[PDB]
Amino acid sequence: HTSITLVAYAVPEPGWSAVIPAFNASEQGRGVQVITSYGASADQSRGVADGKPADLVNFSVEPDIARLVKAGKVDKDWDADATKGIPFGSVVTFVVRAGNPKNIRDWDDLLRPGIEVITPSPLSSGSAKWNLLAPYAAKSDGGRNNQAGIDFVNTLVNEHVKLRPGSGREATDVFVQGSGDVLISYENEAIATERAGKPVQHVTPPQTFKIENPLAVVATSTHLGAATAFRNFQYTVQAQKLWAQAGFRPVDPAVAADFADLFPVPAKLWTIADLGGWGSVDPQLFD
């Protein structure tokens, strides 16, 4: 039948590869084959902004959707929904080696002597932006003492980050091969890596950041019938259960309640709204 292409960021594949078969077994999804493309979130956003074929976008951070809106590739209606265009999300977590040999439990543990932190580059990855928003929000109490938030990230980046992988997936790879003592990553990526039999576990710091992964239909697509059907299917009860089962925190309040016992609330869940939204974080960015 028809073919649609999803240009997604680096780590959402475990959920997408579970939802697409369910989509293809539905009335509107039978026959519409979904091609997928995963990579560094910002790199993927730029690709579609300058010609890369796409019928749907699913990026790590909302700015990577706004770039496409600024370029006429994503209609502005994409977040006027009560959903705000966010079908799922995650939290920032510490990926750690099996047994937590170095006993990493909190953000102060990343500043201990000799601890190397694995985290991607904010130029190409949205994972890198979540990974730095959480310690900033934690050490600054959500923008109140803005200086010790910066001063923490300062000491974390300069003295404990040397590798600069392009994406969260690339950060997971080099960490699995043996580089670094703690990898800051999505909770879904830690769950997916653990399940692949890799000898790692994860501890979420008491204060962490709420990851919200946006999804939007590409306006310049010749398949907005199927593309809209594939986007709306994500908010169904079944798809929300599937994302949850894949390790991604669903936005359906009933499914999120059903899976609340596997997606534990931290001591403090910082959100982009706590910092004044992306409108006040995106032009202030660390670098």
Side-chain angles (χ1 to χ4, degrees):
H1 210 34
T2 308
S3 182
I4 53 172
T5 294
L6 170 67
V7 172
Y9 60 113
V11 306
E13 183 272 347
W16 284 117
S17 60
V19 152
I20 292 160
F23 176 59
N24 289 136
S26 80
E27 42 160 308
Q28 66 279 64
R30 184 130 281 270
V32 46
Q33 160 221 27
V34 179
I35 310 146
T36 57
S37 178
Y38 311 97
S41 190
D43 287 359
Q44 292 275 273
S45 187
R46 283 168 209 122
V48 188
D50 282 299
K52 176 158 196 247
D55 301 280
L56 287 115
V57 279
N58 171 231
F59 291 145
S60 171
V61 295
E62 179 270 341
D64 293 327
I65 300 294
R67 175 189 291 100
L68 299 199
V69 185
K70 215 88 177 55
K73 300 278 183 178
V74 161
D75 176 307
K76 330 151 182 53
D77 70 6
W78 75 273
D79 74 330
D81 199 339
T83 68
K84 299 227 202 187
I86 287 135
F88 60 84
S90 193
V91 293
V92 178
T93 187
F94 297 149
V95 181
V96 86
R97 282 173 202 299
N100 201 344
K102 285 160 184 308
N103 190 40
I104 312 291
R105 309 277 165 196
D106 68 2
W107 285 110
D108 279 340
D109 283 326
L110 304 204
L111 296 187
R112 272 155 52 188
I115 292 302
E116 177 189 6
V117 169
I118 306 304
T119 177
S121 188
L123 294 209
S124 51
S125 176
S127 168
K129 292 157 179 174
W130 302 117
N131 288 2
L132 301 195
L133 278 163
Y136 170 75
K139 289 313 199 187
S140 77
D141 200 62
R144 279 142 194 113
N145 166 272
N146 164 91
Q147 186 57 23
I150 302 279
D151 288 10
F152 176 92
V153 167
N154 217 320
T155 311
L156 172 72
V157 170
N158 287 340
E159 320 196 338
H160 305 275
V161 187
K162 181 60 157 49
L163 299 181
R164 267 299 213 210
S167 65
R169 173 56 39 85
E170 293 179 1
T172 314
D173 294 343
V174 80
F175 180 85
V176 152
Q177 271 274 250
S179 301
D181 308 299
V182 47
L183 155 76
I184 324 187
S185 184
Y186 312 79
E187 188 198 37
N188 51 259
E189 177 82 330
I191 291 167
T193 306
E194 271 143 30
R195 285 179 172 159
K198 288 329 195 114
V200 294
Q201 32 196 74
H202 68 278
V203 200
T204 311
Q207 305 196 54
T208 193
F209 212 85
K210 184 204 202 173
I211 300 187
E212 303 189 289
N213 304 119
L215 164 84
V217 156
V218 159
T220 63
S221 153
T222 70
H223 297 304
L224 293 214
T228 306
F230 190 43
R231 178 208 70 201
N232 294 347
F233 181 79
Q234 304 313 317
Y235 296 93
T236 62
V237 160
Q238 184 196 12
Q240 288 286 281
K241 280 181 183 160
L242 293 167
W243 284 108
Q245 290 155 19
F248 303 80
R249 282 162 184 246
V251 299
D252 193 314
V255 176
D258 296 355
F259 284 84
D261 64 288
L262 293 324
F263 301 123
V265 60
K268 180 60 174 181
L269 188 62
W270 293 111
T271 68
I272 211 70
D274 303 27
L275 295 199
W278 296 97
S280 170
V281 153
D282 247 14
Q284 174 53 320
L285 39 62
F286 325 79
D287 267 337

